[PDB]
UniProtKB/Swiss-Prot annotation:
Domain annotation N7-MTase: ranges: 239-459
Annotated function: Plays a role in viral RNA synthesis through two distinct activities. The N7-guanine methyltransferase activity plays a role in the formation of the cap structure GpppA-RNA. The proofreading exoribonuclease reduces the sensitivity of the virus to RNA mutagens during replication. This activity acts on both ssRNA and dsRNA in a 3'-5' direction.
Whole-protein residues included: 5949 to 6449 of 7096
Protein name as annotated: Guanine-N7 methyltransferase nsp14
Binding site for Mg(2+) 1: 67, 134
Lineage of origin: Viruses, Riboviria, Orthornavirae, Pisuviricota, Pisoniviricetes
Length: 459
């Protein structure tokens, strides 16, 4: 109960237009053999080219939608499309490349997958809506065998080179021509009525159909993300650390404490309505305020309607005091809000393309986030950068260049010169803030927010 048994049945109805006469009774073992791959009864870490839905969810960073369309099948050219937007034409003799033989097409496939995946995953998972030509084209660019390590490092092998007879990971495969031990999953095996477009269009209006293979590849991965991360949610699955995860999460905690502490000091709200994570803790535990929590899990489909979160009969009066929405995605924030909203458009190794404008943000856990929409912030303004501290000016225990800044809200800056301690803390805070912003988080606040009101907390 870990891998997909090769003896599991494979429904072949979707394959019978490309492969007429295909047997209805089919296993992964017989299908893999039909594809031209010999498994030789190998107990060396690669029991099946195909994987379970559960294993595919654990390796979502490796997902590459793949489709093959007949341009004209041994005699006809094939259009190979990938969810990266690339279309390659292979001759047997939205980027669109002209027809070239397989020996050069396979070098491009390896280069493209390596650049897309080296900072995301240790493997590739081809996400298919299998009709036949994609499965039969794999023998022209895929090699299989025992699990291996890279020739230049300790990572698992993802590529093979016929020129040198060596194996490489995604980071060391320059000049390699074969994809080695890829994984794959057929979305058609999940139980669907109707074609790819009809199922995809039920949940997404952002991916159209220009009738090229890459359009189908994108729609296939999109539908798979919808099924595994939008209609079904598993927040218990852990994902490996691949970048700045720990620094981003630490920065998020620091920024939240800073902004909320300052909003309470500047406007002295008698009550704070904390809307979001049912396991949230008070981000400013020493604040005088009446802290009230409201449970809402992360929305993965569409943003919450403020009318459903707040109305239908709690302080009841959400208009009293301030509302804190820390990564709680709503359609239109109330005017009295402090907000952190993840911008789905951000380019990063943590943020993967999602469904209907949304993105899949993977940092320890996977969170499909609804599309970022600027109109949600109409009653608020962007929160300006600032650093506030009421801690004593005392160095304790890296060198020094005098800090001059209008945004260092400290007693030392009020009285002229910034002390070394507050200058060090200001620089660390600025780095944390820039880290969080660059990760894709955006901050918004009630229009009356004014850091000028923080200087009088030093009297
Ligand atoms: C396009 C060149 C030439 N090549 C072949 O044509 C041999 O391919 C054969 F061994 F599979 C190998 C090299 C990696 O790319
Ligand atoms: Zn390597
Ligand atoms: Zn889509
Ligand atoms: Zn100071």
């Amino acid at each position: 109960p870990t891998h997909l048994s090769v003896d599991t049945k494979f429904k072949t109805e979707g394959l019978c237009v490309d492969i007429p006469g295909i047997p209805k009774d089919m296993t992964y073992r017989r299908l893999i053999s039909m594809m031209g791959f010999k498994m030789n009864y190998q107990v060396n870490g690669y029991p099946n080219m195909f994987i379970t839905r559960e294993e595919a969810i654990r390796h979502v960073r490796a997902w590459i939608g793949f489709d093959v369309e007949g341009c004209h099948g041994t005699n006809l050219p094939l259009q190979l499309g990938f969810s990266t937007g690339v279309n390659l034409v292979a001759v047997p003799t939205p980027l669109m490349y002209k027809g070239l033989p397989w020996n050069v097409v396979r070098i491009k496939i390896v280069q493209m997958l390596s650049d897309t995946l080296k900072n995301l995953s240790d493997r590739v998972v081809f996400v298919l809506w299998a009709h036949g030509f994609e499965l039969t084209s794999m023998k022209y660019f895929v090699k299989i065998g025992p699990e291996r390590t890279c020739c230049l490092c300790d990572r698992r092998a993802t590529c093979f080179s016929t020129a040198s007879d060596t194996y490489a990971c995604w980071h060391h495969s320059i000049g390699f021509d074969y994809v080695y031990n890829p994984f794959m999953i057929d979305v058609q095996q999940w139980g669907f009525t109707g074609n790819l477009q009809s199922n995809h269009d039920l949940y997404c209006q952002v991916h159209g159909n220009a009738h090229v293979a890459s359009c189908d590849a994108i729609m296939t991965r999109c539908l798979a993300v919808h099924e595994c991360f939008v209609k079904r949610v598993d927040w218990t699955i852990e994902y490996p650390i691949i970048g700045d995860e720990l620094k981003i999460n630490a920065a998020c905690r620091k920024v939240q404490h800073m902004v909320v502490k300052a909003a309470l000091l500047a406007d002295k709200f008698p009550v704070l309505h904390d809307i979001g994570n049912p396991k949230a803790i008070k981000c400013v535990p020493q604040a005088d305020v009446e802290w009230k929590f409201y449970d809402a899990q992360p929305c993965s489909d569409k943003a919450y309607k403020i009318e459903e979160l707040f109305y239908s009969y709690h302080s009841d009066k959400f208009t009293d005091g301030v509302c804190l929405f820390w990564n709680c995605n709503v359609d239109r924030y109330p005017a009295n809000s402090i907000v952190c909203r993840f911008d789905t458009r951000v380019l990063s190794n943590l943020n993967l393309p999602g469904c209907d404008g949304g993105s899949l943000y993977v940092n320890k856990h996977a969170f499909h986030t609804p599309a970022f929409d600027k109109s949600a912030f109409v009653n608020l303004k962007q929160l300006p950068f600032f650093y506030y501290s009421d801690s004593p000016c005392e160095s304790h225990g890296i060198d020094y260049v005098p800090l001059k800044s209008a945004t260092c809200i400290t007693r030392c800056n009020l009285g002229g010169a910034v002390c070394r301690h507050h200058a060090n803390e200001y620089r660390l805070y600025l780095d944390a803030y820039n880290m969080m912003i660059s990760a894709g988080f955006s901050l918004w606040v009630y229009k009356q927010f004014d850091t000028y009101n923080l200087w009088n907390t030093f009297t």
